Amino acid sequence: MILQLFRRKSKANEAIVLRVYEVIVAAARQKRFYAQFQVPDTPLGRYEMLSLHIFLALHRMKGENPALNALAQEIADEFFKDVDHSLRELGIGDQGVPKRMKKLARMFYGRVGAYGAALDANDAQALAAALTRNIRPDLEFWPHACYLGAYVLQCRDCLREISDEALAAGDISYMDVDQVD
Ligand SMILES: [Mg+2]
Ligand SMILES: [Mg+2]
């Protein structure tokens, strides 16, 4: 029976990873970020939204639960495959860019760490400052940074309330940004 069970759960795992990743990608594509909030609709701005939503998932999943730690590894794997391809779309290959993937991973984990510290401290000012630094560094004041920060705080709250069991089964959700006010 154990081979049958291992195979069934391995197949199910692939279906779970696909649906979880698709939910994250859809959340990052919500139109309000690029219309009202003035997140740039550019290769880099779209990366800032994907990385923000991937961060939120990893931040929730990190802990002592083996199933959630494994799902986090899967989502990180899919994210870095995605970003690899996005860089190649801009002519950023390995030619003249040694250690490209190692540098990208440092770009991700280093820049989203400020989001984690701000969320753990429930510090909305720190969160808006980190979002401005990462997404609209051209502006000393970004009028919609506090709006995006409110959305990020509410997503953290929602993700935390989902049970470990439901999340490991693929039942992830984010807030509808259009309902933020
Ligand atoms: Mg995989
Ligand atoms: Mg792409």
Residue ranges per domain, the chain? 1-181
Give residue 106's Cα distance to chain centre. Answer: 15
| Nearest listed ligand to the Cα of residue 10 | 1
CA of residue 5 to ligand 2 center, whole Å: 34
Cα separation, 38 vs 148, whole angstroms: 10
Resolution for the entry shown, Å? 1.4
Q: How far apart are the CA of 45 and the centre of ligand 1, in A?
A: 26
Whole-number Å distance, alpha carbon 85 to ligand 2 midpoint, is 7
Experimental technique, in short, is X-ray
What is the number of the ligand closest to the CA of 17? 1
HSE value, Cβ hemisphere, 13 Å, CA-based, for 75: 30
**φ, ψ for residue 99 (rounded to 5)?**
55, 35
CA-based max dimension of the chain: 62
Ligand lying closest to the C-alpha of residue 21: 1
CB atoms within 10 A of CB 129: 16
Total residues found in the chain within this entry: 181
Dist. CA 96–CA 79, nearest whole Å: 23
